[PDB]
Design a protein around this motif. Structure first.
Motif, PDB file in Angstrom:
ATOM      1  N   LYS A   1       4.350  -7.310  -2.800  1.00  0.00           N
ATOM      2  CA  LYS A   1       4.329  -6.429  -1.621  1.00  0.00           C
ATOM      3  C   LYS A   1       3.456  -5.209  -1.866  1.00  0.00           C
ATOM      4  O   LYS A   1       3.078  -4.608  -0.900  1.00  0.00           O
TER       5      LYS A   1
ATOM      6  N   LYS B   1      -2.620  -1.214   4.929  1.00  0.00           N
ATOM      7  CA  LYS B   1      -1.615  -1.798   5.844  1.00  0.00           C
ATOM      8  C   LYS B   1      -0.851  -0.659   6.510  1.00  0.00           C
ATOM      9  O   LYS B   1      -0.241   0.112   5.787  1.00  0.00           O
TER      10      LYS B   1
ATOM     11  N   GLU C   1       2.149   0.073   8.269  1.00  0.00           N
ATOM     12  CA  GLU C   1       3.456  -0.608   8.470  1.00  0.00           C
ATOM     13  C   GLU C   1       4.243  -0.492   9.813  1.00  0.00           C
ATOM     14  O   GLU C   1       5.034  -1.372  10.413  1.00  0.00           O
TER      15      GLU C   1
ATOM     16  N   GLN D   1      -4.098  -3.904   9.824  1.00  0.00           N
ATOM     17  CA  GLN D   1      -4.605  -3.944   8.440  1.00  0.00           C
ATOM     18  C   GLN D   1      -6.112  -3.744   8.516  1.00  0.00           C
ATOM     19  O   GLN D   1      -6.739  -4.074   9.506  1.00  0.00           O
TER      20      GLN D   1
END
Ligand SMILES: O=c1[nH]c(=O)c2nn[nH]c2[nH]1
Ligand SMILES: O=c1[nH]c(=O)c2nn[nH]c2[nH]1
Ligand SMILES: O=c1[nH]c(=O)c2nn[nH]c2[nH]1
Ligand SMILES: O=c1[nH]c(=O)c2nn[nH]c2[nH]1
Ligand SMILES: [Kr]
Ligand SMILES: [Kr]
Ligand SMILES: [Kr]
Ligand SMILES: [Kr]
Ligand SMILES: [Kr]
Ligand SMILES: [Kr]
Ligand SMILES: [Kr]
Ligand SMILES: [Kr]
Ligand SMILES: [Kr]
Ligand SMILES: [Kr]
Ligand SMILES: [Kr]
Ligand SMILES: [Kr]
Ligand code: NA
Ligand code: NA
Ligand code: NA
Ligand code: NA
Lengths: 296, 296, 296, 296
Positions: free
Chosen positions: A273, B20, B22, B27
């Motif tokens: 991740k 990224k 979130e 992205q």
């Protein structure tokens, strides 16, 4: 000994053509690389030094330029068909002409939001290609393709559930990078001759545009199980959209982007991740191929 | 004998980084190729087999990846400056770091007219580059460039009034094709160090965008007297638009497109006003270079 | 704005020349690629669209062919010097000519152990090059080089005792593969003009042969401590053997061959003393550079 | 839709292997690039996202390295046959393995006239290749080739007596340059399996050496009527010398060297018997192909 197969001609013939609308001033350019190889009753050029059966490769080159002057160079399926038909019709002893065309991109520039009448940019090295096989008594076999379409997605690619044995080190993954260079080919139904190719002319540009659009949208939207499963979805959609296509073939490299474990350095977390920085691998590469046709 | 100059390091280090969001799912990807070469008190590695002064090239490679993990990789002028500063600060005996970065295009895909959150296309082989020279006690010298921008215009290029003597065969022309691969470099004012580079960060992307826009608009709109005269117009406009640039350099091939006389064949007219089909020449090519600075 | 530097000309001019001994039937071929760039009072071609100061690049190309017809093309140091001198002497306003020559290998074939009179093989892509800068009032600056000489040794290369810190993962080794592509350049003393170059003609082929022989023998026989230490030995030997050379420069990639740990598979031993199968790495690569001159 | 054909695997797998004679100190190196593509009951990986049928491409790569560790990598016909046989035997559902190998040259250096025990030179980019198709129940189909063998002859090439019509401009010639890059392929009789390949091992190196020797001697000695007539002579000689070959195929570019008329310049004579300086043409090029087999 005997000649079992022979073909000869001119390769790497660079051609440009301009269209000038004298009324609007708008100019449109076309650029390609052409190869023409001929077959026929030519074995004695090989076995007996009999050059009387040779249409010189230099003459083939002149013919490509003359054909471009006298005929449309677009769509390339038509140009190829005209050029190949010329050779088998003009020369009694020439029975097949194999025409390969690579089309180079010259996309009109937008300057201050308006299309410029005579300025163009090479917006990538993506090609549009044809392979046109004109065979006396057997018609015209056309394969159309796009190639060099380089894409990457940063997530929504997976690869797990593959065979694991004593040769296997690869970790299963539920979230990886997928990047490829798309080579997609559609094989047309055999055409009886140049008239039948001319009757389908609008279908060539439309089917190229469909193939490109299906490839991009499928790549972007598929939460991919594998290159295999994603490419099959592209092929089945293109077949569904053009009944005059017999098969769709993809050849796709898996251009690997490797995670970099940095945990040896101050405990930096850059895997799973936390993966942010990757090492693109130049080689080796996966290579995945499919030919898809219509079911029985 | 003695060492007069030396530098060593790691070349062809491919790096990818993903950002990224979130919260939005968006992205953003960055890909480059990096070279770092170091200079300093290293002559004894060459003359005495003294490897104690060598920061291994493998370690330089690890440092590039670690630096990318811990710092922004954009703009490349900043990344280069961070990376070079790291080496001259970390190692007492390293006095200069030469950082070359090639940035590869990954343009977000539009799917059904909406920007896709994680899918990208390589829309050409055009590069954005930097050369960052970090020299202990002399600051940071940055050259920024765009390269591989391939363009063609089908008219509004001329070339006449050049010197004619017994070596001259070229015909004057009032209407030709002009095609080139643009290599444009802007040389920044010397920066005192990394803080001064950080203070100018917004100027790097803006000046690249200006250079690109000026190049395209000037190419498209100039009724060109010569490559020389058109490139000078691009350089003078970029200098006028960024006071923090000292010089602008262009290096431009003249990628020739030759007329094809077909009059030997059925009197076909394909020259001058009737020129439609041309032969793109792979070689040779004109090569035209300028460095433009501000007048006394 | 003002022009700070400018040069223009023709690049990628491919040239072949044949010598025919009519008495023995022996033919000898020479093939090169040539670039000539001119400097002088040409700024107004850039700033004022004044093409009267331009010797067309097409004319430069014609001049290269005419010069090859009327003069020896070997050694390339002489050819370059003749060609550059022609431009600064012929054109009052041209003050410098920059001539780059790449020489392609055409090695005479041995057929049934006898040298063939007119058949040749390209025995590698290794090049012999020159850079000849002919500057009005400053003479002729020549750099000679060999490039693309690809070599590998399977042992008698080491790399240990380098700096180890928190960025270091590389293991010390006492026995590794070393492979490189040799780029070696020797910089001649400034020559006053073409007469002085002609006075040294035999030294050019001899110094190239010495550089090549020293490079190969040193690579093969040095139990190498590092690329740095081995390349310095080559440079110091070439300087010792030609007093008319001021400096010797090497630029050497370290083309890495990585061990492959197979111990995960049936306990196979393929590391250290048992290392048999390796993975050649395409990128990244070490890049090691030196310029060696004579000590104070 | 349905899968009509599929194959997948790993491409561009670079492999090096060293042999060390501990008694003499002599080391011998081998370097190749390998591609392995598998076929079998794999359609459900494409149609149903069923990765259970996939031997990962990463695993195929590991297998190539393990196979090289445990088996000879020479001749490449044998290595390919071992590698392909491994896949169809190990995996019940894999029914064919397609192995392509490119062998890179590492020729032992002679230093002061003695062969060096562990130093090598890449003496050209000529390759030795194999294509090995291992098909369960149908045996092993091997094509062997040499490629990238670049040659030129400066006379004893002719091209006259070819077809002349309204497309023809090429002048007949009784004395021209001939230059090509040789691609020569010999197709072996089908082998029943790996045992039959092993039974013919000495024939592989010997037939490669014969093909190379015949190609060079025929090129050098034939007073060539055409590329067609010269290549046929090479093919018929190779067939006469190895009964275990079914066919010989050549694919040869005609890399044109054009005369340069300089008569416009001071009446210089550089055509016909006075032709000394030529312009090598990068493109276009003739492309001449033959497959020769044994007569009825
Ligand atoms: O999409 C994938 N397909 C495969 O066959 C494979 N093998 N390794 N990784 C892979 N990824
Ligand atoms: O734009 C041009 N510049 C030149 O210097 C030149 N020389 N030939 N053609 C040319 N075109
Ligand atoms: O010869 C070497 N020189 C270096 O500077 C180096 N760094 N890593 N490996 C190396 N090998
Ligand atoms: O050897 C040749 N074969 C050909 O078929 C040909 N055509 N032009 N020149 C040629 N030369
Ligand atoms: Kr075209
Ligand atoms: Kr895909
Ligand atoms: Kr379609
Ligand atoms: Kr990056
Ligand atoms: Kr330009
Ligand atoms: Kr700017
Ligand atoms: Kr030459
Ligand atoms: Kr070296
Ligand atoms: Kr020397
Ligand atoms: Kr190998
Ligand atoms: Kr030939
Ligand atoms: Kr043979
Ligand atoms: Na016919
Ligand atoms: Na320092
Ligand atoms: Na002068
Ligand atoms: Na099987």
């Amino acid at each position: 000994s005997a000649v079992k197969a022979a073909r000869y001609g001119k390769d790497n013939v660079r051609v440009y053509k301009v269209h000038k609308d004298e009324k609007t001033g708008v100019q449109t350019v076309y650029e390609m690389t052409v190869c023409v190889l001929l077959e026929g009753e030519i074995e004695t050029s090989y076995t007996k030094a009999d050059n009387s059966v040779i249409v010189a490769t230099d003459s083939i080159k002149n013919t490509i330029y003359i054909t471009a002057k006298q005929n449309p160079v677009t769509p390339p399926e038509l140009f190829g068909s005209i050029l190949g038909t010329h050779f088998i019709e003009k020369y009694n002893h020439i029975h097949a002409a194999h025409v390969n065309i690579v089309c180079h991109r010259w996309t009109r520039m937008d300057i201050d939001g308006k299309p410029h009448p005579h300025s163009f940019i090479r917006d990538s090295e993506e090609k549009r290609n044809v392979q046109v096989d004109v065979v006396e008594g057997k018609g015209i076999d056309i394969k159309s393709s796009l190639s060099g379409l380089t894409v990457l997605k940063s997530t929504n690619s997976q690869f797990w559930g593959f065979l694991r044995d004593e040769y296997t080190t690869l970790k299963e993954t539920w979230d990886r990078i997928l990047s490829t260079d798309v080579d997609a080919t559609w094989q047309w139904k055999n055409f009886s001759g140049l008239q039948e190719v001319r009757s389908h002319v609008p279908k060539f540009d439309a089917t190229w545009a469909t193939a490109r659009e299906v490839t991009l949208k499928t790549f972007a939207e598929d939460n991919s199980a594998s290159v295999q499963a994603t490419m099959y979805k592209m092929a089945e959609q293109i077949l569904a959209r053009q009944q005059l296509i017999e098969t769709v073939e993809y050849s796709l490299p898996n251009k690997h982007y490797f995670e970099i474990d940095l945990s040896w350095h101050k405990g930096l977390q850059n895997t799973g991740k936390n993966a942010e920085v990757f090492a693109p691998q130049s080689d080796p590469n996966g290579l995945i191929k499919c030919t898809v046709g219509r079911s029985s």
